[PDB]
């Protein structure tokens, strides 16, 4: 072992001590109204979660059309999606709580 | 060249060897049903892609 190479390796290793991962991957355990997320043997509650606005917005049950011919129709929202147990999400850590950005599926 | 400043610069440069970029930017070549993405002279297929729901 040449001491110069060992010193260079030591510098490269010790330079990484303070670094933190960019993002986290998590698995859901409960449905969206009472959301629970597990990552790194830690379960998050609703006090610890910031979520994307579109996720909350799209869970609208029903909406109505404008009137015409003295009658109206009711249309059921087809974009509603409550996360099932076992799904994967991408999340970013902001201070003391995690921010959920999107849900990933294999296409 | 003062050797102390050179040593500090060497430390600053060698501390960055293991770091990896946070994100990547890519441009599509084929439409969504058969998606293909090019980044860093690499073309991704559907075996290599996870997409937003």
């Amino acid at each position: 072992a040449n001491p110069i190479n060992e010193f260079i390796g030591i510098i490269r290793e010790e330079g990484k001590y303070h670094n933190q991962p960019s993002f986290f991957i998590g698995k859901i355990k409960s449905k969206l109204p009472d959301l629970k997320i597990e990552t790194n043997n830690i379960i998050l509650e609703k006090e610890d979660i910031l979520i994307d606005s579109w996720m909350i917005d799209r869970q609208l049950e029903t909406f109505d059309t404008e009137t015409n011919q003295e009658h109206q129709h009711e249309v059921k929202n087809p974009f509603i999606d409550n996360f099932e147990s076992g799904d994967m999400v991408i999340m970013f850590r902001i201070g003391e709580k995690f921010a959920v950005v999107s849900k990933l599926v294999s296409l | 060249a003062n050797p102390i400043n050179e040593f500090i610069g060497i430390i600053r440069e060698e501390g960055k060897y293991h770091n990896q970029p946070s994100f990547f930017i890519g441009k599509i070549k084929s439409k969504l049903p058969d998606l293909k993405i090019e980044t860093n002279n690499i073309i991704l297929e559907k075996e290599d892609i996870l997409i937003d729901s």
Binding site: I4, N5, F7, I8, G9 | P3, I4, E6, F7, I10
Partner: peptide, 23 residues
């Protein structure tokens, strides 16, 4: 001044090793 000479030698050695490539 001994520390300066030692630092100069160490810097030169490290630069040569960087050029040569270190695993």
């Amino acid at each position: 001044a001994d520390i300066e000479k030692i630092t100069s030698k160490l810097v030169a050695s490290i630069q040569l090793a960087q050029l040569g490539g270190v695993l």
